[PDB]
Design a protein around this ligand. Structure first.
Ligand code: MG
Ligand code: MG
Ligand code: MG
Ligand code: MG
Ligand code: MG
Ligand code: MG
Ligand code: MG
Ligand code: MG
Ligand code: MG
Ligand code: MG
Ligand code: MG
Ligand code: MG
Ligand code: MG
Ligand code: MG
Ligand code: MG
Ligand code: MG
Ligand code: MG
Ligand code: MG
Ligand code: MG
Ligand code: MG
Ligand code: MG
Ligand code: MG
Lengths: 102, 90, 54, 62, 117, 70
RNA sequence: CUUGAGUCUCGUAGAGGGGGGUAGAAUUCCAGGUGUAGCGGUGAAAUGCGUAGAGAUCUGGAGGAAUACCGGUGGCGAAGGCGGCCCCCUGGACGAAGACUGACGCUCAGGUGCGAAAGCGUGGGGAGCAAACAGGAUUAGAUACCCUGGUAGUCCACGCCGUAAACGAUGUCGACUUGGAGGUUGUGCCGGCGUGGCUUCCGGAGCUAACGCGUUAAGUCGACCGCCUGGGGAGUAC
């Protein structure tokens, strides 16, 4: 329906669970005739400043083209899941595919 | 656009040049051969009589002078030249 | 009383005093570049000292 | 300038954005960096987004 | 008693006074002096000289402990905002590091009203 | 404005670096400013004065060169 | 009938409005550790805070309010006004070629709606600030200015009030009349040359009692509305 771009970071010690999380989310997305246009994964990077006294986090870029309700579910999912320590959901004007500078 | 990014080129405080002055102020002179790039050298410098020297007096326009770099302010984008140093230490 | 004081020194102390009292350079009353240099010279020395005064 | 025909300065271009902040993370004004009006506004949004994600700092004192 | 070697010297330069305190590098106070305690009052209390005394009379409050290193950490706009950094030198420490940590709100709270006089 | 001291660097070269560190970070300006609350009308009225002055500091550099003393 | 007015197609810039999330800096508090005699404040002082351990310094927690830098004689809005970041709903403007309607327009007494700050009602909230109030100073006196505290209020929801130097002290719409330097936002054709919108400063003719205004007119005209008729008494009394 409409494009986005997620960029969720996740608690370092629990990086093992990230491939699962990516697996899960990209199911819900496309499980409503969505799409994936990009899905890089930056992996244990250094935080410019602390976050709940952490000095590292596992980052996961991801683009989408979904309708609103699924991209909405997804945001709530991030809220309650407490391994996900930051979220971010920009809109974008088009699909974005080309690989990121990370 | 380009030159300011890779200003390592003449970064070291010890580095010295011969640049050419554009205009004078009464607090400095500006010595600009590097092109798209330009220093100052403050009136404090240029002499060993501190300010007992008008920039007009020691130097005049379109005049090449030997100078060391002292301070480059990568951002704020301003280089601090020195003219009293590249000549004598009385 | 018999002879006028050094014009350069006076010009340098007038500069200092406008400095400390916080007037703008470009109040300088001299165009004689010689006296002008003294005036600003004072005015900039004074700019340093204001900082450490209250 | 960021006028190598750029459409929309990007926040994750951390290499580039670093040229437009200072040591203490403060954004550098257009007049210093020669940036055009509407590239400065993009440059602001990007650095602000970045700061959220902790790809760039707000300060030195933290 | 327990010697240290590596310390840090916080300096609180207000317009009216200058507090200086040496601490261990986990910020545990060891000694301190002020201009007010140095023996200056009012007009005098608020000078770079009175701040100097403070710094050096705080230096010979921490002889008990080791010395050599000292990273200075200055805060506020007072006149005591260097005369101290100077004094600690001739007190005989080596200043490895030195930084302004003056707090600034990124907006924050409404300041008091302006003084009419 | 966080200067670490360099190998064999004199103290009175670190100090002057440190001073120039916060001159260019404009600290005392920021603190001086926020000692007291300025009404938003006053701040905005200051901003015009700055402008109508700056402007007339792009006039002397022209006009003087046109006129002449003695 | 297509030149005024409008509709559609593709894009652009924007603190325009409404709702909901969230992030860093800082202040105040609460709980700990370190540590010891002063802190705070002023022109100078004192009230105040502190050996029941303050101030300073480090760690943890709570809570509200505002959004440094970017930031500019920048931008948006009918005006009042609007400034972190992110999604949801939503208004207006502007341009490029095309197509479409065919004078459908301009103005507007009464009417209707929006309308800063203070203030009022009900229910929340309360860090900082601060009318009232209290104490300390100053002074011949000081119901003030200055200092120490500090309650309404400032914040949120809904409802009232309808006012401001609500100002460009300049009603709205259209036409015409030498120039110069900028700012911001589109688009043509070759980093030069054009063509649109909005805007800042300067000045020519003209106009003006003068100051000044000057293609964003206070110039030259047309359409409609609002308003003035010596000063007090009075924007008051009934
Ligand atoms: Mg005060
Ligand atoms: Mg804390
Ligand atoms: Mg027809
Ligand atoms: Mg009416
Ligand atoms: Mg009405
Ligand atoms: Mg109100
Ligand atoms: Mg009442
Ligand atoms: Mg109320
Ligand atoms: Mg209440
Ligand atoms: Mg108070
Ligand atoms: Mg009061
Ligand atoms: Mg009283
Ligand atoms: Mg609401
Ligand atoms: Mg209301
Ligand atoms: Mg009225
Ligand atoms: Mg009126
Ligand atoms: Mg007209
Ligand atoms: Mg004019
Ligand atoms: Mg007219
Ligand atoms: Mg008239
Ligand atoms: Mg009357
Ligand atoms: Mg009445």
């Amino acid at each position: 329906m409409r494009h986005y771009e997620i960029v969720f970071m996740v608690h370092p010690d629990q990086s093992e669970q990230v491939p699962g999380m990516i697996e899960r989310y990209t199911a819900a997305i496309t499980g409503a005739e969505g799409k994936i246009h990009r899905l890089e994964d930056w992996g244990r990077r250094q935080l410019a400043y602390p976050i709940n006294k952490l000095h590292k986090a596992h980052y996961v870029l991801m683009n989408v083209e979904a309708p609103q309700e699924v991209i909405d579910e997804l945001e709530t999912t991030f809220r309650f899941n407490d391994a996900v320590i930051r979220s971010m959901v920009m809109r974008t004007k088009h699909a974005v595919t080309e690989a990121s500078p990370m | 656009e380009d030159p300011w990014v890779a200003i390592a080129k003449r970064y070291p405080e010890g580095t010295k040049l011969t640049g050419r002055v554009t205009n004078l102020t009464d607090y400095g002179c500006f010595v600009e051969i590097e092109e798209g790039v330009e220093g100052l050298v403050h009136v404090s410098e240029m002499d060993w009589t501190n300010k007992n020297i008008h920039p007009s007096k020691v130097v005049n326009v379109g005049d090449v002078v030997e100078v060391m770099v002292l301070d480059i302010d990568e951002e704020r984008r301003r280089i601090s030249l020195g003219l009293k140093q590249c000549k004598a230490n009385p | 009383k018999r002879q006028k004081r050094d014009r350069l020194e006076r010009a340098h102390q007038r500069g200092y005093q406008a400095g400390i009292a916080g007037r703008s350079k470009e109040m300088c009353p001299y165009q004689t570049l010689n006296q002008r240099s003294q005036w600003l010279g004072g005015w900039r020395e004074a700019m340093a000292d204001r900082v450490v005064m209250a | 300038f960021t006028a190598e025909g750029v459409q929309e300065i990007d926040y994750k271009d951390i290499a580039t954005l670093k040229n437009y902040i200072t040591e203490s993370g403060k954004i550098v004004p257009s007049r210093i960096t020669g940036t055009r009006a509407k590239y400065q506004r993009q440059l602001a949004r990007a650095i602000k987004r970045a700061r959220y994600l902790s790809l760039l700092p707000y300060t030195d004192r933290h | 008693r327990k010697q240290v070697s590596d310390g840090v010297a916080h300096i609180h330069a207000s317009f009216n006074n200058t507090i200086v305190t040496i601490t261990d590098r986990q910020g545990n106070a060891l000694g301190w002096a002020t201009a007010g305690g140095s023996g200056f009052r009012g007009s005098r209390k608020s000078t770079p000289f009175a701040a100097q005394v403070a710094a050096e009379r705080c230096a010979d409050a921490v002889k008990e402990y080791g010395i050599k290193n000292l990273e200075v950490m200055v805060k506020g706009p007072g006149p005591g905002r260097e005369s101290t950094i100077r004094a600690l030198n001739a007190a005989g420490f080596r200043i490895t590091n030195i930084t302004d940590v003056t707090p600034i709100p990124h907006x924050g709270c409404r300041p008091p009203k302006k003084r009419r006089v | 404005p966080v200067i670490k001291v360099r190998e064999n660097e004199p103290f009175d070269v670190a100090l002057r670096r440190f001073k120039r560190s916060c001159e260019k970070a404009g600290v005392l300006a920021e603190v001086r400013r926020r000692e007291f609350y300025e009404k938003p009308t006053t701040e905005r009225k200051r901003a015009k004065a700055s402008a109508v002055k700056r402007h007339a500091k792009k006039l002397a550099r022209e006009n003087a060169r046109r006129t002449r003393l003695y």
